[PDB]
């Protein structure tokens, strides 16, 4: 359709307004004194939140261009959430700060490209400086978990031990307990999410759950639909849920499965094979050995139509997040899986490239799941405990993949980079833009407290090291001694993502959108 | 004509906007880092100023009610200017601060009357506290003189020289120097201004100047016009200028003289007799002896019509300001004047009431005069140097019968009154309203510097005594050691006038104005 | 009437538009390739000009605020025209450049006061640097004379001839030639203009001309009107024109004379006495000796009314410009004047202060006169040649007590100040604002040629010294060798006036004007 095009400054103003609308709505929920935000529910009473992520999801503007700006900075929160699993609001306040001052410098005549270069330089030097000041050990892992579950020491300990058993990389799932106590057991996960939403049968978690499903392993991309019908019929009996782990399921057959899940029971859930090219099919073999199935390869491609339930692997349970699929308890234990492990473990011995050995080591490391059965007290208490552990786990994993909290770490880092220079004046301005934005988080936390940000900032900048401002007690002191910590992971992730999106927007010279007319 | 009436809140909002428009325009010119304000000239290039008084004079709003508010607070500046002769901008920032928070408290439900009482209480305790922090010895006279003269050591010394010669209670005048340099000599003025403007033949100074005029001294109030005609005719020859120092010139004969000055040469200038009742006519006799004239009393009232030029005293020159008339060089020197002095000097000996002696002492003091002849710098700068000396002289005499500058004095005073309470909560709120307004001056000075007012204020409040912030060098230190002083006179006057006008506005419940329709 | 008030940015935008409208209209006429501007005549064919001054006079905008901005920058042209007598367009392009970038920096957050300080610092260092790149010997006088006379060798020589005869400090006048050719002869003026316009009987020159007028010399300020009537009556016979050289003529008697000149013949013309205080009356005596009159002093003040025509001096002709009065051929030659000269010449011998001798030397210099009689070219071109000579003469005398043209001088000066810094970043920005504006003149000259300003500017900045761009031949080369010179006077005056007005506007925080409604 007819488009609307805006260049330079005209496009810059529309972007700035859009980011301000989103950022302002989000930033009010920062810190222990974060204010509430009312999100109008389609039906019933409105939602009350202090959670930034929840607020951002609702932000969409009428002005096509402003909305573009809001959707661009919304990428900061989502990316930081996907990486660190926390600190999205901090990322949003940092992004806005860099974009605000960045665009103002552009309007002043500064070179967009130079500005970006200066900002990027400040961020690289900042992250390394952040490392110097610095969630690896179980002490920290247990400390983050408890914090994520309202100081519940029980939950933090369960997570720490869970990660200590299967490694801070292994698959971990939370299940219901069987009469009090807290159980932990490894009962025999790849980076692939559902090819399309809607498969999400549990909207609250944004994940797909399948109980005792069959797993169709294919080495080709499904698109034909029709030749899949005979396999679907076979799965329609007993094991209702079906998990398709093919090379890829094209929009053709994929759209058919999506339309079939609606109304027609649980049906099927589709994801793509882990890895690519050569290692893709060898990786599929590992899944086949776990689940006890047969991979329908190129030559067996004709067989895709006459694939019996014997060729379909099976598992006790499977959970598919946005970008992670975990197969819990596969059917083909010991003998099969262990023999597979013996082969690959012998592959590393066949010394070739150091690369191969690393990749093969990842495979043997993958071939079980560690289930955490929660404290089964009464009935409702067990449901809450599971809700606590579930959220606390998710937050700890992101925290794993500490520095003084309250935004003092970034301020302390900015003080060190005061002499940082670039190749020119514009690059120097960009550097200072980044350093001024590193004060934004603390200033916003203080602003929400009802105190003057300029004063508190000045005082903390006057202090040294872990000297910061406790927004909870309205008192200054040693942040770490007061227990106000931030994983170095969430802090650097928030800064890096804020700077990348901000860098893109500052480098933008033209915007195109469908005309309202 | 038809009026427009607004009550309570409706009237309060209109007043607040009006005061904000005036105050905001004025306050930008506060301190050493005061910003410029462009005043559009009717013809030619616009005026550029950092002088608050000049800006305020131009302020007039379209909205009848808002204009009323602006004209009300404009009274603060004019009154403080008339009293201290400086600190009008400080007075305006104080007024706005009290009015802003005062009206907000009113809108919150507070009792206007109680609020005013609390504010007034805070101001009375503040001025006495200001006195504690703040003139007999020559050191004190010279010190306050330099401060009032904008840290000019020369001027401060001159005021000390004069008060050392004729005494601190003696007569002191200032005029241009004959042969450059800077002179001071002792050679052998009452509180009454022109009864009506227009007589002002010199618009630039806002004063009336008469050269070799005749002085008609009358002990009755002129209103008849007609019986004055014969005397005016006699003065129409040779000594064109005429000065009427009668008991009072009623609007009847006064309006006739005003209409006659226009087009009909310089004509006459009218003022009323110094003092009142009994001492009024005895005071007139003193003027008669100086000028060498005869006072037309009650009985001589008929003679008012046949008053010859012999009865009219004469002087070399006379200058009539808004509220001061000065007779320069009277004709009747030595013998006449000296004999008059001998009588009154002998009156004080006739011990009766201590009161009489004080009043009689004022008379003999008026009838030598220490003539300060300013430094003749290009004969153009003579006017600037002259103005600076008379302003400093006036301030020094008032002091005879300094605090830390940069608005730190008021802040230091506000710290002492932190425990000040009233008869109720509303009175306590009003007290705090006044104390918060005492920080306004410093915060505005800092705001104009480009620095954060909340931070600098916090730091100065953390210090002690003369510890303040030098806005010129952007450095903290001992204000007095840095030479940043403020006459206690300008400071207390600015606060008192700000509080009085603010008290009136906060007590206002109804506004009436001519309808625009 | 009701006013309209605008603050900060709102006032800044209105000012910028106004200055842009004026500057843009004016700058198109800059240089040898200046474009034409059509000025609509009230009656007849429109005016066609390449003269900037003529264009500026016509500029007046509808928007009250924008007009204020235009009238403010219009002050740059008028002031530079009054000082250097040329370079108004250059001044206007410099002003606009400083204001444009200055206001943009303000909008960016920069401190107005700091900016002004930086600009002022750049200008002071620039003018001294300009002096370095830039008059005792006849060669220097003639050289600067030709340059000021638009490279006219003839005029430059004449100024050298005159200063060789009566000295460089001597008196020099210019007038029409009697018998064509071009004459120069030595036969046996004060800084005071008409107290009020309207006296200007010759609108084309903006000056007052009186033929064989009487000269009333008074040592007091006239205001009485009435006592002047008898003297006016005496002058009403024979010598119709009258010139009043009193201490000052106050608006009272002045307004009466102005109303009398209208309809009532030529009447009288009033100006104030040269100098002030003591030397004022001694200076009046010198005029009295020339014209052959008697000065009515303080004591003779009564005589002001009975001042006979014998007391009134007389001259052959008198011309009163805006700020200069010249008495041509006084009646009291030789004996009287020469005796007066003998006294003052003997005063300098009485060694006291070096100051007195300088001032006394100025008096004897005023009381021979080198009469330059312009080349009589058709008696019509005589007026053009005459104007050109007096403008060049005025400029040469100022130089006694040239740089590369085409705007290259300022560019060369800006290159030197590349390392100039201030007390802070804002002051550094202001400095750079001034340096960027110094390229404006050349860029505008090139822009009018039809060539790319950025390219030519870059090339000249790449060159050295007098290397510039000849806009006439479209060729680069040594400006001075090509004969493209600019008096250092016009260049520094244009820069200083541009910076002062720009400094005021940048310091402006509020604008007030009569409401259109």
Going from the C-alpha of A46 to that of each of A29, A56, A323, the distances in angstroms are: 17, 16, 30
Q: 3-class DSSP state for residue B86?
A: coil
Q: Is A108 on the interface with C (CB under 8 A)?
A: yes
Helix (H, G, I), strand (E, B) or coil at B390: helix
Residue A426: both structure tokens together:
């514009």
Q: In sequence order, what E strands does C431-500 have?
A: 467-470, 475-478, 485-486
Give the β-pairing of A475-478 and A467-470: antiparallel
Phi, psi of A62, rounded to the nearest 5 degrees: -75, -45
Cα–Cα nearest to A342, from A318, A364, A313, A319: A364
Query: Does C104 touch chain A if contact means CB atoms closer than 8 Å?
Result: yes
B-contacting residues in C 213-232 (Cβ below 8 Å): 220-221, 223-227
Structure-token pair, residue C319? 């011309």
- Chain A: give the shortest CA distance to residue C109, in Å: 10
Using an 8 Å Cβ cutoff, are C442 and C460 in contact? Answer: yes
- H, E, C per residue of A376-442: CCCCHHHHHHHHHHHHHHHHHHHHHCCEECCCHHHHHHHHHHHHCCCCCHHHHHHHHHHHHHCCHHH
Interface with B, mutate which of C220, C509, C511 (most B CBs under 10 A): C509
Residue C507 has its nearest CB partner, among B25, B48, B266, at: B48
For chain A, the residue count is 517
Structure token digits, residue A210: 């399948």
> In angstroms, rounded to a whole number, what is the distance separating the alpha carbons of residues C482 and A457?
62
Of the candidates C364, C382, C365, C381, the one whose C-alpha atom is nearest the C-alpha of residue C373 is C382
Give the residues across from C269 on adjacent strands: C243
Tell me how long chain C is. 517
When scoring B45, B202, B205, B474 by the number of chain C Cβ atoms within 10 A, the one with the most, hence best to mutate, is B45
Which residues, other chains included, contact C86 with Cβ-Cβ below 8 Å and sequence gap of 6+?
C148, C391, C395, C487, C490
DSSP label of A228? G
C-beta contacts of C53-60 below 8 A and 24+ residues apart: C53/C77, C53/C81, C53/C88, C53/C89, C55/C25, C55/C26, C55/C29, C56/C22, C56/C25, C56/C26, C56/C88, C56/C92, C59/C21, C59/C22, C59/C25, C59/C26
Question: Phi, psi at residue C469, to the nearest 5°?
Answer: -120, 120
CA–CA dist B389, C207 (Å, integer): 40
Residue A5 contacts B, CB cutoff 8 Å: no
Distance CA B177, CA B374 (A): 6
What CA–CA distances, in Å, run from A65 to A1, A74, A350, B38, B165?
A: 16, 14, 57, 38, 80
* Helices assigned H by DSSP within B226-334: 229-235, 251-261, 277-291
Closest residue by Cα to residue B159 from B177, B148, B190: B148
How far apart (Å, rounded) are the C-alpha atoms in residues B158 and B156?
Answer: 6
List the single residue in B36, B40, B45 with the smallest CB-CB distance to C507. B36
Q: Do A104 and C108 touch (CB under 8 A)?
A: yes
Q: Kindly state whether B265 is in contact with chain A, defined as any CB-CB distance less than 8 angstroms.
A: no
Q: For chains B and C, count residue pairs whose Cβ atoms are closer than 8 Å.
A: 124
B101: distance to nearest CA of chain A, Å?
A: 18
**Residues in a beta bridge with B49:** B37
Closest CA relative to residue A310, chosen from A290, A295, A326, A298: A295
CB contacts, 8 Å: C116 with chain B: 36
Residue C472 is labelled as binding a ligand: yes
Q: Which residues of B are annotated as a binding site?
A: 29-32, 50, 86-90, 406, 470-472, 486
Helices (H) and strands (E) in chain B, counts: 18, 19
Chains in contact with C, where contact means 3 or more Cβ–Cβ distances below 8 Å, are A, B
Binding partners of B (≥3 Cβ pairs within 8 A): A, C
Method: cryo-EM
Q: What are phi and psi of C473, to 5 degrees?
A: -95, -5
C71 CB neighbours in chain B (<8 A) are: 41, 43-46
Give the span between the Cα atoms of C221 and C281, in whole angstroms: 13
Query: How far is B498 from B76, CA to CA, in rounded Å?
Result: 6
Give start and end residues of each alpha helix (H) in B205-324.
229-235, 251-261, 277-291
Mutate to test the interface with A, among C108, C110, C426 (most CBs of A within 10 A): C108
List the structure tokens of C73. 């920058």
Angle at C192 between CA C191 and CA C193, to 5 degrees: 130
Contact residues on chain B for C114, CB-CB shorter than 8 A: 450
d(CA B501, CA B447): 25
- In chain A, breaks (C-N over 2.5 A) are found after 134, 188, 367, 401
Question: Two tokens at B478?
Answer: 């001992």
Phi, psi (deg, nearest 5) at residue B285: -65, -35
Instruction: Tell whether C471 is in a known binding site.
Output: yes
Contacts of B27 in chain C (CB under 8 A): none
Pairing of strands B47-49, B510-514: unpaired
State the residue for tokens 């007598």. C85
Identify the helix (H) or strand (E) that includes residue C147.
helix C138-148
* Residue to test with chain A: of B457, B458, B462, B469, most A Cβ within 10 A: B458
């Amino acid at each position: 359709a007819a488009k609307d095009v805006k260049f330079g400054n005209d496009a810059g103003v529309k972007m700035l307004r859009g980011v301000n609308v989103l950022a302002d709505a989000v930033k009010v929920t920062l810190g222990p004194k974060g204010r509430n935000v009312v999100l109008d529910k389609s039906f019933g009473a409105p939602t009350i939140t202090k959670d930034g992520v929840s607020v951002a999801r609702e932000i969409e503007l009428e002005d096509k261009f402003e909305n573009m700006g809001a959707q661009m900075v919304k990428e900061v929160a989502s990316k930081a959430n996907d990486a660190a699993g926390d600190g999205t609001t901090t990322a949003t306040v940092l992004a806005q700060a860099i974009i605000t001052e960045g665009l103002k410098a552009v309007a002043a005549g500064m070179n967009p490209m130079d500005l970006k270069r200066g900002i990027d330089k400040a961020v690289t030097v900042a992250v390394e400086e952040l490392k110097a000041l610095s969630c690896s050990d179980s002490k920290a892992i247990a400390q983050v978990g408890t914090i994520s579950a309202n100081s519940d020491e029980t939950v933090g300990k369960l997570i720490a031990e869970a990660m200590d058993k299967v490694g801070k990389e292994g698959v971990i799932t939370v299940e219901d307990g069987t009469g009090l106590q807290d159980e932990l057991d490894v009962v025999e996960q790849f980076d692939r999410g559902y090819l399309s939403p809607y498969f999400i049968n549990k909207p609250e978690t944004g994940a797909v759950e399948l109980e005792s499903p069959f797993i169709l392993l294919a080495d080709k991309k499904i698109s034909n639909i029709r030749e899949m019908l005979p396999v679907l019929e076979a799965v329609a009996k007993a094991g209702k849920p079906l998990l398709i782990i093919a090379e890829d399921v094209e929009g053709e057959a994929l759209a058919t499965l999506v339309v079939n899940t609606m109304r027609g029971i649980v049906k099927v859930a589709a994801v793509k094979a882990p890895g690519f090219g050569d290692r893709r099919k060898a990786m599929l073999q590992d899944i086949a050995t776990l689940t006890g199935g047969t991979v329908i390869s190129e030559e067996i491609g004709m067989e895709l139509e006459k694939a019996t339930l014997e060729d379909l692997g099976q598992a006790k349970r499977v959970v598919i997040n946005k970008d992670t699929t975990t197969i819990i308890d596969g059917v083909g234990e010991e003998a099969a899986i262990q023999g597979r492990v013996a082969q690959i473990r012998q592959q590393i011995e066949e010394a070739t490239s150091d690369y191969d050995r690393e990749k093969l080591q990842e495979r043997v490391a993958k071939l079980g799941v560690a289930v955490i059965k929660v404290g089964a007290a009464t009935e409702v208490e067990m449901k809450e405990k599971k809700a606590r552990v579930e959220d606390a786990l998710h937050a700890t994993r992101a925290a794993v993949e500490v520095v003084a909290g309250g935004g003092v770490a970034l301020i302390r880092v900015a003080s060190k980079l005061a002499d940082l220079r670039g190749q020119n004046e514009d690059q120097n301005v960009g550097i200072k833009v980044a350093l001024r934005a590193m004060e934004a988080p603390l200033r916003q936390i203080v602003l929400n407290c009802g105190e003057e940000p300029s004063v508190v900032a000045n005082t903390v900048k006057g202090g040294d090291g872990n000297y910061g401002y406790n927004a909870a007690t309205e008192e200054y002191g040693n942040m770490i001694d007061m227990g106000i910590l931030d994983p170095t992971k969430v802090t650097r992730s928030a800064l890096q993502y804020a700077a990348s999106v901000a860098g893109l927007m500052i480098t933008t010279e033209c915007m195109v959108t469908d005309l309202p007319k």
